[PDB]
Design a protein around this ligand. Structure first.
Ligand SMILES: CN(C)C(=O)c1ccc(Nc2cc3c(cn2)cc(-c2cnn(C)c2)n3C(=O)OC(C)(C)C)c(Cl)c1
Length: 252
């Protein structure tokens, strides 16, 4: 029922998609009756460290547009000292919400999503970006295709957290997180979701004596991937280029 202006162009609000730290995401309709998502960021109580992190995310989102279709499309933006408006493509739903609703995940949709996740995370790594905070919420379903929504530059779950991030951070950090997302899509839980206590959870992730259970499934390829990603030592963990050449991703 409402309306907002981004670079002379008018957008009518359909619904509010999300909220957070001085930031509201909306589903909008433009003058050509096309659907988009607008993220509004209030900079009134924002400092220079915050502004430059936001400016850095917009710059990376803007550059990585051209390098991959697995990155959310950023159509337009308006930046002032009071706010930011980002006009982006609209997804159907985020991966976290889609997984929370779904009682079972189809092996084909799973393989397809995995491919998308590796291509997206691979792309950011080629530009010196390591996310380090990957979770299903950073992924959006856009016409059966997964897209990466942020680069960790600008939920606080810890279930997808690599052992190296706990120790106190290389492209291998993201492999651990992607492994945890695939583990959830495989077994219906993250490898440490059983641990109610958050400190015991952290003590279990770093501890090598704490064996991660990999139950036997029909897809033995999918089992090897999980076993390769979830190696507590970054040095002994599989790389993204090697994951893209794995039989799980490649064999039809
Ligand atoms: C359970 N939820 C809230 C949903 O069903 C839901 C979730 C996501 C939706 N799509 C959607 C969400 C979107 C975007 C584009 N489309 C863009 C963004 C975005 C925010 N920052 N950056 C740099 C990109 N975005 C987004 O942040 O979505 C969440 C609020 C769900 C996390 C829609 Cl239309 C509905």
């Amino acid at each position: 029922f409402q309306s907002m202006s981004v670079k002379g162009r008018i957008y009518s609000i359909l619904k509010q998609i999300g909220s957070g730290g001085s930031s509201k995401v909306f589903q909008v309709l433009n003058e050509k009756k096309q659907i988009y998502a607008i993220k509004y960021v209030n900079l009134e109580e924002a400092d220079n460290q915050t502004l430059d992190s936001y400016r850095n995310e917009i710059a990376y989102l803007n550059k990585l547009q051209q390098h991959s279709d697995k990155i959310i499309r950023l159509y337009d933006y308006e930046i002032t000292d009071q706010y930011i408006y980002m006009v982006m493509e609209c997804g159907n739903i985020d991966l976290n919400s889609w997984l929370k609703k779904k009682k079972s995940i189809d092996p084909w949709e799973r393989k397809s999503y995995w491919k998308n996740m590796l291509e997206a995370v691979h792309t950011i790594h080629q530009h010196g970006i390591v996310h380090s905070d990957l979770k299903p919420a950073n992924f959006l379903i856009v016409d059966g295709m997964l897209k990466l929504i942020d680069f960790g530059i600008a939920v606080g779950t810890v279930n997808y957290m690599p052992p190296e991030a706990i120790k106190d951070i290389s492209p291998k950090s993201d492999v651990w997180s992607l492994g945890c997302i695939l583990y959830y899509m495989t077994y219906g839980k993250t490898p440490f979701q059983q641990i109610i206590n958050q400190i015991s959870k952290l003590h279990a992730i770093i501890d090598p004596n704490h064996e991660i259970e990999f139950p036997d499934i029909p897809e033995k390829d999918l089992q090897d991937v999980l076993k390769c990603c979830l190696k507590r030592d970054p040095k002994q963990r599989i790389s993204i280029p090697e994951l893209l050449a794995h039989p799980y991703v490649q064999i039809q």
